[PDB]
Structures are given as structure tokens and as C-alpha cells.
Curated annotation (Swiss-Prot), chain A:
Function per UniProt: Poly-ADP-ribosyltransferase that mediates poly-ADP-ribosylation of proteins and plays a key role in DNA repair. Mediates glutamate, aspartate or serine ADP-ribosylation of proteins: the ADP-D-ribosyl group of NAD(+) is transferred to the acceptor carboxyl group of target residues and further ADP-ribosyl groups are transferred to the 2'-position of the terminal adenosine moiety, building up a polymer with an average chain length of 20-30 units. Serine ADP-ribosylation of proteins constitutes the primary form of ADP-ribosylation of proteins in response to DNA damage.
Effect of residue 39 to A: Decreased poly [ADP-ribose] polymerase activity
Cellular localisation: Nucleus; Chromosome
PTM text: Auto poly-ADP-ribosylated on serine residues, leading to dissociation of the PARP2-HPF1 complex from chromatin. Poly-ADP-ribosylated by PARP1. Acetylation reduces DNA binding and enzymatic activity.
Full protein stretch here: 92 to 206 of 583
Subunit structure: Component of a base excision repair (BER) complex, containing at least XRCC1, PARP1, POLB and LRIG3. Homo- and heterodimer with PARP1. Interacts (via the PARP catalytic domain) with HPF1. Interacts with core nucleosomes.
WGR domain location: 13-110
Family statement: Belongs to the ARTD/PARP family.
Outcome recorded upon mutating residue 63 to A: Abolished formation of a complex with core nucleosome and HPF1, leading to abolished ability to catalyze serine ADP-ribosylation of histones
Effect listed in the UniProt record for changing residue 36 to A: Decreased poly [ADP-ribose] polymerase activity. Impaired formation of a complex with damaged DNA
Name assigned to this protein: Poly [ADP-ribose] polymerase 2
Domain of life (superkingdom): Eukaryota
Tissue-by-tissue expression: Widely expressed, mainly in actively dividing tissues. The highest levels are in the brain, heart, pancreas, skeletal muscle and testis; also detected in kidney, liver, lung, placenta, ovary and spleen; levels are low in leukocytes, colon, small intestine, prostate and thymus.
From Swiss-Prot, chain B:
Result when mutating residue 62 to A: Abolished formation of a complex with core nucleosome and HPF1, leading to abolished ability to catalyze serine ADP-ribosylation of histones. Abolished DNA-induced ADP-ribosyltransferase activity
Result of changing residue 110 to F: Reduced recruitment to DNA damage sites. Decreased poly [ADP-ribose] polymerase activity
UniProt remark on domains: The N-terminal region (NTR) recognizes and binds poly-ADP-ribose chains produced by PARP1, leading to its recruitment to DNA damage sites.
Coiled-coil blocks: none
Cell compartments where the protein resides: Nucleus; Chromosome
Known outcome of mutating residue 110 to A: Reduced DNA-induced ADP-ribosyltransferase activity
Protein name per the record: Poly [ADP-ribose] polymerase 2
Upper lineage: Eukaryota, Metazoa, Chordata, Craniata, Vertebrata
Subunit details: Component of a base excision repair (BER) complex, containing at least XRCC1, PARP1, POLB and LRIG3. Homo- and heterodimer with PARP1. Interacts (via the PARP catalytic domain) with HPF1. Interacts with core nucleosomes.
Residue numbers of the full-length protein present here: 92 to 207 of 583
Sequence similarity: Belongs to the ARTD/PARP family.
WGR domain ranges (all copies): 13-110
Organs and tissues of expression: Widely expressed, mainly in actively dividing tissues. The highest levels are in the brain, heart, pancreas, skeletal muscle and testis; also detected in kidney, liver, lung, placenta, ovary and spleen; levels are low in leukocytes, colon, small intestine, prostate and thymus.
Effect upon mutating residue 38 to A: Reduced recruitment to DNA damage sites. Abolished DNA-induced ADP-ribosyltransferase activity
Protein's job: Poly-ADP-ribosyltransferase that mediates poly-ADP-ribosylation of proteins and plays a key role in DNA repair. Mediates glutamate, aspartate or serine ADP-ribosylation of proteins: the ADP-D-ribosyl group of NAD(+) is transferred to the acceptor carboxyl group of target residues and further ADP-ribosyl groups are transferred to the 2'-position of the terminal adenosine moiety, building up a polymer with an average chain length of 20-30 units. Serine ADP-ribosylation of proteins constitutes the primary form of ADP-ribosylation of proteins in response to DNA damage.
Organism the protein comes from: Homo sapiens (Human)
Amino acid sequence: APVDPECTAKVGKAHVYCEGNDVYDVMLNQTNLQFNNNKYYLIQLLEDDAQRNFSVWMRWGRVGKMGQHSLVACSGNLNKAKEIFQKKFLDKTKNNWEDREKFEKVPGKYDMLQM
Amino acid sequence: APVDPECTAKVGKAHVYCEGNDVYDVMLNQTNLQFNNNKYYLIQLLEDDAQRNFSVWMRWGRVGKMGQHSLVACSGNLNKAKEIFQKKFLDKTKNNWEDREKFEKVPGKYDMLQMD
DNA sequence: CGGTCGCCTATAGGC
DNA sequence: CGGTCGCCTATAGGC
């Protein structure tokens, strides 16, 4: 549910977008001790409290460290933000956002934690 | 479920292909008295009795008259015949073959008459 | 593969 | 559209 604290520009001024049972916040993990992988990938779709104004927030890196990030603004174009979000999730999990109740991790890609 | 009599080349030598609940024989109708439409379109996928050899049979025209037709042969390629068949049905009904239990006629397109 | 970019191909649609 | 065509573009995916 919460805006990711590291999103300094929007924590306070915004909330994670929801609609029914869809909630656009996800945390991905890939751990593989053989090749030295202990990394996260976080994605959020953010509506401002101020107006109907949108943005997608992505942050990634080694567990522990605060990593690097990307904020992508979408003005009032909810459809765009949803695409960007869904597409990113897909690139990193090889599952669709829509089929996440039946999530199945794939070798070589990130796994998902439930919220 | 019969080979269409007008298919002279294959009536006697062949039968309508079936596969589970799928039976590849369909009759389409478009009647619209306002624009003067009283036309059928018949499609059949035919397996020979002789061997595993395939063909799609299409006949169409004004109700009453025997119209024109097209026989398309597919040798042993069942998959091809099924595509040709399904694709034609789609062009003329704007429904998929797969979803025909829940068929919904579309304005401007053919309707499907449900067999026996 | 964190980011991002961009051929080629195979279709699907407009005309 | 009842048959057939074939350009050109826009689009989506694989690599």
C-alpha cells in the first residue's frame, strides 16, 4: 500500500494507484547465490493527491543498498502509465500483470513477492 | 450429416469431417428484404472415404438457385483445410468458429442456421 | 540487462 | 462482396 519512501519527490504528495482489486505496487526479487545475485526491482504507479496526475516509479539494486531509480511522468494519461508499468513487470518476470494470481517464476528472471 | 449433393466430385467418395463435438458443415444465411438480400453461403470440410485426403467445399448464391462454388483441395493437410474453413466462416459471420455455441449475428453479415 | 536502442521479419489493415 | 489481386503502411515480436 505505501508510497516507497525513497521516492522523495512524491511521498506525502501522492498515493499508490488502486482500482478495485488492482493495486499498482510490486516488489521483485532475484536471488541466485551461485552467480552472486541478490537484487530487487520495485515498481509503483502513482496518482497525486493534488490532482488526477500520474507517474510510474521504478527502483532497483542490491538488497540493502538504495540503488538507482526512474520516475516517469504521464500527466493525465492513466493508460500510458499502466502500459509502462505492465510492460516493465513483463520484461522482468516474463509473466503478465493480469495473470499474477497464477504467478510462475521463470529460470533467469525475477520472482515476485505478494503484498 | 451429409455431403452437399451439388458437390458432384465428392458425394459418394467422401464424408463431412468430425472431431469431438466439432462437425465441419455449416449453412449461412443473410436475408434482408430492405436491401434485396436473400442469399446463402454453405461451407464443408470433406475427408475422403478412400484415404486420409482433404478438401473444403464452398457454395453460395441466391436461395433457390444453385449458385457458384469452390472446391479447394488440401491433400493430407488437415490443418490447412481447417484454417481455410474457419477463416471463411469468420469473414462471413464475424464470429469465430470456436465460439459458435454462443453465436451472435452481426449487422451487415451472415447468420448461421443451426443444423438438426 | 540496471538503463536504453534498433534492425529484421511476419502480420494485419487500409485503399 | 460472390470470386480474386496486391501495393503500402503500421505494428508486434525475436534477437
